[PDB]
Structure formats: structure tokens, C-alpha cells
Amino acid sequence: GSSKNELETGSASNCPKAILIFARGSTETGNLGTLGAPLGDALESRYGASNVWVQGVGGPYDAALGDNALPRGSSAAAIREGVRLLNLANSKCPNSKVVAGGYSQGAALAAAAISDASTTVRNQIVGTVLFGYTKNQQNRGGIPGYPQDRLRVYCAVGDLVCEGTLIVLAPHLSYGDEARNEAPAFLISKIGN
Numbered sequence: 001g002s003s004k005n006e007l008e009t010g011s012a013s014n015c016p017k018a019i020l021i022f023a024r025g026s027t028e029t030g031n032l033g034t035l036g037a038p039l040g041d042a043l044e045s046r047y048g049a050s051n052v053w054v055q056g057v058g059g060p061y062d063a064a065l066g067d068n069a070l071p072r073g074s075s076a077a078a079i080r081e082g083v084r085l086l087n088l089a090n091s092k093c094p095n096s097k098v099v100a101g102g103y104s105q106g107a108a109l110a111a112a113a114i115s116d117a118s119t120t121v122r123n124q125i126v127g128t129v130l131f132g133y134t135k136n137q138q139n140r141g142g143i144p145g146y147p148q149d150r151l152r153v154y155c156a157v158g159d160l161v162c163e164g165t166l167i168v169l170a171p172h173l174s175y176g177d178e179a180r181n182e183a184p185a186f187l188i189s190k191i192g193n
């Protein structure tokens with residue numbers, strides 16, 4: 001489908017301006033899902049496709065429904081895969097700008113992976129977007145250890161997963177416009193001209 005693996009396939013001899021690492025929502029196919037794919041497209045339209053590596057969080061992250069109930073909102077193995085990818089970006093391309101994101105379970109995964117990441121890796125992540133953030137309430141609109149200016153949380157009116165519950169209703173499926181417009185505009189501001 002819409003998956004992207006450019007951090008895995010790219011050459012440390014041609015590091016890009018930006019690397020996006022994005023985690024999909026529960027039951028979404030591929031490694032980007034409905035929001036990661038247009039978010040990556042938008043960054044490639046702004047900077048050129050060869051100047052952005054788009055990477056989804058796959059492998060061990062199976063976006064299983066039951067893993068929402070685990071304490072941080074995803075599996076330990078899925079969070080560790082997020083960390084692994086952030087570290088691969090830092091090992092291959094330490095001076096590339098990293099931007100991160102997630103939807104739904106994937107926003108919990110991203111938040112936990114950024115919390116667990118080294119000071120070096122968190123410093124390289126210039127911007128993060130979270131859509132339908134399942135730990136919005138519990139993490140008070142932030143990511144632990146991550147400066148607020150680098151974050152945007154998109155929590156729709158009536159998306160109760162942002163309100164300390166795991167109740168999934170139609171507003172949870174409303175983020176496509178933000179993934180094509182406000183969210184990439186924010187990441188572009190953090191990457192720079």
C-alpha cells in the first residue's frame with residue numbers, strides 16, 4: 001500500500017534535509033496508515049522527494065487493538081522499534097532534521113519512544129505531530145521530556161481518546177485535512193526553509 005521505508009533504504013552518503021518517522025493507528029495497514037502517507041507526501045512536495053526520507057514504524061509494531069490498554073498505550077516492543085528507528089536516523093544521518101509523528105495508538109508509541117530516546121536523539125527531533133493522541137489527557141497535552149514548542153497535538157472535538165478514555169468515535173477519523181495542511185506546515189516551520 002502507502003508504506004515508506006526510506007530511512008531503512010537510504011544511503012548515509014546522501015543524507016536528506018529531513019527524515020519523517022511516523023507510527024500508524026490501530027489496525028491500519030502498511031507502516032504509515034491514512035495520515036502518515038499524506039504527511040510524508042506534503043514534506044516531499046515542499047522540499048523534493050529525494051530530500052526527505054519518509055519512514056513508517058513497522059516490524060514489531062503490529063498496531064494491535066488490545067495494546068492500547070497497555071500502560072503507555074502501546075506494546076513495549078512497538079515503542080522499542082520507534083526508538084530503534086530514531087537511533088538509526090541519528091547513526092546514519094546525525095545532521096539531518098528528524099520530524100516524528102503518530103496517529104492514535106501510534107501517537108502513544110511516538111510519545112513513549114521520544115520520552116525513552118537519548119538526549120542526543122530528542123535534540124535531533126525538531127518537530128512532532130500527534131493526531132488523536134491517546135495520552136493527551138494523561139500527559140497533559142505534551143510528551144514527557146520534549147519541549148512544547150516542538151509539538152502539535154491534533155485532538156478533534158468529540159475524539160474521546162484525547163480525553164482520558166479509549167472510546168473511538170467518528171471524530172477520531174477526522175484528521176485527514178490536518179495531515180495534508182496544518183501538520184506538515186508545522187513540521188516545515190521546524191525543519192526550516
Ligand code: NA
Pocket residue numbers: 006044048049050051052053054
Ligand atoms: Na523521499
Ligand code: NA
Pocket residue numbers: 156174175176177178
Ligand atoms: Na479535521
